[model samples]
Target: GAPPIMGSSVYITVELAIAVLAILGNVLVCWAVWLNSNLQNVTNYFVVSLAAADILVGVLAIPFAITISTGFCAACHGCLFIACFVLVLAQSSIFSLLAIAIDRYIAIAIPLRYNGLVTGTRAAGIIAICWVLSFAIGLTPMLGWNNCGQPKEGKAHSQGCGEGQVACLFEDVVPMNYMVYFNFFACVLVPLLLMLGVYLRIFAAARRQLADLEDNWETLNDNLKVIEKADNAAQVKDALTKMRAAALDAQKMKDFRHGFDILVGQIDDALKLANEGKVKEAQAAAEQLKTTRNAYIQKYLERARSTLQKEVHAAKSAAIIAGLFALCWLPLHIINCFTFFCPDCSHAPLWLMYLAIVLAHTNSVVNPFIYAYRIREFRQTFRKIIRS
Candidate 1:
């Protein structure tokens, strides 16, 4: 067989193109914001920080990824370079997205207090936390605690031969329990919880504020109706009209706040349950998440419903992204688990293990697009910077 080369080139080209586009776009994002003082803000600063990380991953990580996917390991780059590359990109992408979510929650829900809450220094601190977390996670495979190892050679191991390593990738059973647990927790569980908490608090605060406004409006309206025919006519009328208009505006703000909070809450809560070690709960939560998300869609019918958009989009996007993420890492981990738990039946397909590596590499390339497109100000600022 000629090795079924047809779709392989397509994958390589697409992957490389994605890597290039990400690097170029993200570099510009960093440059535009950093150079132009006007573009700097707590929010966009976080974005540029993320874009910098994305560019690093795209430029440094993806080529290594392409080499691995195209059937080479321990061939050109050493394990250390690959490991660090993997660590920086993987950790940076996940953590940066988490930061962006938290920042958004603050901006939308607590507008009056956001300036104080999310200063440039605070954004930098958040960015620092993200990098530290990402680096820690990526270092797992590097430390040999995550069941990964350089391939060992054998005639029976012809599959790993192309990359000049005996084994295409490393896996051990004992470490993987920790590895999967860590991946699930650091990569999936913890960040999911953090994001949910931010959005929930945002929604709750918005709702509470809205309720207060509506009550104040009703009280003012009642007072105005009484003062309408007062003996102090001109002065009373002026005071009554101003008070009444303020009341109505406040009521509208409250209603708008309440309605939007309910919709956003549905999605955030669903994601929250999913993070809390409740898979069935997650599955159940997805239903509520979906129903509420769809209800928002049915009402406004535009994808730009502001508050609802972040909640719904992130939940669904995380579901899709996390699902893809799990798919990439799960196979190798499961194989290692089977080997560790029942070494006698270590009959997992060789090719499938390598296949998992390829799929997993896709995430490092794909996630930035999700971030760039979904975040409104990031996208606009990114475009503005690029065009100028």
Candidate 2:
């Protein structure tokens, strides 16, 4: 080589740092699943697939993208191969996103059927479909749909070098025609839009559920207040109301139902006592109603301790992954659309392109940290990995 070819030191440093962190975080998640049998659930396995994709970017694509010299990519005949390989890696990421979105939709739409049907067989099949489709779409440019010819010329146009081109940039090898039309529109854009629609439906369903739950709880609590305010046979009706609500709560907290039944029987006795002249014996039993309600709430404290913490944490993780996924990935494809569709518009600056790549790589770096911070098991696993 004459001297050396290099990108901005800071930019390459940022790329290297992202690559290393992504590798570390993804490996930690993968190892966490392998070491702990609990994390081997179908949805968590989709996480493992996403980690695998990010890990590939860290190991393969990042290094290739960082290599700025012309001699290697041009002389070694890897310009086409590497460009295509990174596309496969990139496509894998969006496919993983689509899988997770599909999983979420199924989970929310038909919880019973989803639990039974989304087993290892179906999940493995879905994963196979995504990756195989990814490879097919990504490799099409290499097969035929490419611009690796002389720019509007009948001369020998192998690839890369042109009248003024220096290094074999990705745009230099892969046509914008492939990137915007096939890759962006057909593959990336369509999947992301489909995910959007699925998520919108899921969110709407969840909103309706919350409203119904609030309505039912409001009715139950209205009945609760009447017991506290009244001094007559109204106590019997309110006590019955409390008993009924307790059973409904049991449906959600099945594990705590054994002791829960005993507590209800205790309140059953109080209602029986208040039914007769024994009401004269304890005029302040209204306070006792509050006391018993507190007792129920005590079990609620226990329920909160054990149930749904992991689920709550996992939702936040998924939320962040989805939010960050679109933000980071969209800009690049949008820029590609602009640069190609409106080539005359000069505002699609170069810094925006690299910035988009950095942002996209950022999504790969973040999931592990989010997993550790949000999910309790991931915290322990990441902590152990740090010590090792």
Candidate 3:
């Protein structure tokens, strides 16, 4: 029996709109990554894989809209298959995103060796493994590892499948107790933890890199100033040596003539001392030297403070973005886990379940905007795409 459609339902409209946005956004992401040679890289390869999974979800989700509208389906093997296959696509999307996070960590954290470590071939291999693992996990349930022994061919019943009761759904059936626990840990918890850990390291590495660059620049500038000061000191020492020799010869001539003025002789001696190699003694004798110590200290304090603030600001933004991604998918996984463990603990409202589903799927739509738009080159390419 076909479920009745509610064209005016807000839930249905929202779901349908999100599905369309997901499909269009991912398609555009894929096209942008494909068409632009600059966007072609190991990192973008993972992104493309991610977009592909979301596109699959959008394609499969059109049928699911009916499931959402009707709230249940009875003995509909086709609908069940759609659900399971979309589950596989969702898992693929999860792993693809995990792959991207790891790629980013390696590229930013260990940049010197990133090229050799994450090559095109290696990236392709990772994407292949993600899809293969998703299929393996998804197909295991549908391949007779469920409450139903096997899918009965050409046998349709009016009895609808209930939550926690295993039902046949093509070659991608849903999970039972142990399988549910396994899926929770394997698909949701582990991946979420890994992504968070990797992103934290990436954020730290970014801050560290900025600090190191600034430190090196400041060190180089300070060394240059020291070298200049030392050169000036050496020149002053040489001039002092010549002036002392001339003054001694004049004193010897004055002593021979017995006509030397004592005040004039003392002035010559002070001038010689002022140009000596000992910087402190020379400055004291000259009484006109201006030290740049206070000026240098003030300038350094300002630059150092600015550099520290900038790095912290950057790290904070990155961490918050990563946290948002995790937050979006977390509620659904939590609800799924709870439902699997205790189906009768409490029956959650249908709207709450739908909200979870909507939140989970929104990650697919958000990825392209956050990941691609943040990059200048990618943004330029996207603009060109829109303009053309």
Measured by TM-score, the strongest candidate is 2
Which lDDT values do the candidates have, in the order given? 0.55, 0.69, 0.60
Clashing pairs in 2: none
The digit string of per-residue lDDT tens for model 1 on 1-388 reads: 4465655676667667767776876676676667767667775665666567667756777676555444344442354445446656666766665666676666666556988877888678877887787777766555655323423455215654554443323332124555456665556557666766765675666566545555554554454344433444343434334543443454234544554465445434544554454444444533443354355423432322354546545445544544455556556556655755676785677556546655665555554465457655546666776687
lDDT for 292 in candidate 1 is 47
Model 1: ten consecutive residues of lowest lDDT: 165-174
Query: Can you write out model 3's per-residue Cα lDDT over 1-388, one digit (the tens) per residue?
Result: 3333443266667777888888987888888888989889886787788788878766775456436345243443444555566567767867876776777777666656888877998778888988999987765555655534444433323334554333333222445553457666777678778888887887787777656545643543443344334444555454444433433443323332222233224324444664554554543432221122233323444554575555445344444545665788678667766776786788566678778777876766776676554666667777788899
User: What TM-score would candidate 3 get against the native?
Assistant: 0.66
Cα shift from native, residue 33, model 3 (Å): 1.5
Q: What are the per-model numbers of colliding residue pairs?
A: 4, 0, 1
Once superposed on the true structure, which residue ranges of model 2 sit more than 4 Å away at CA? 1-14, 67-78, 105-114, 149-168, 200-211, 224-312, 347-352
Best candidate according to lDDT = 2
Q: What TM-score do all the candidates reach, one by one?
A: 0.59, 0.74, 0.66
lDDT per residue for candidate 2 within 1-388, as digits (tens), equals 3323244566688999999999988999999988888778788878898899899989987887776322232521356666677678778778777777777767766766987868977888888887898788878877866665543232214443454333456776678888888888888778877877877777776566545445544554565566656667656556555755654664345545644565455556656667764653323443454565465645554444343334334444676787787788889888888888886798566567778888887888988888888877778877886798
lDDT, residue 222, candidate 2: 62
For model 3, the superposed segments whose C-alpha errors exceed 4 Å read 1-9, 65-80, 150-173, 176-180, 216-325, 342-344
| Quality of model 3 by C-alpha lDDT | 0.60
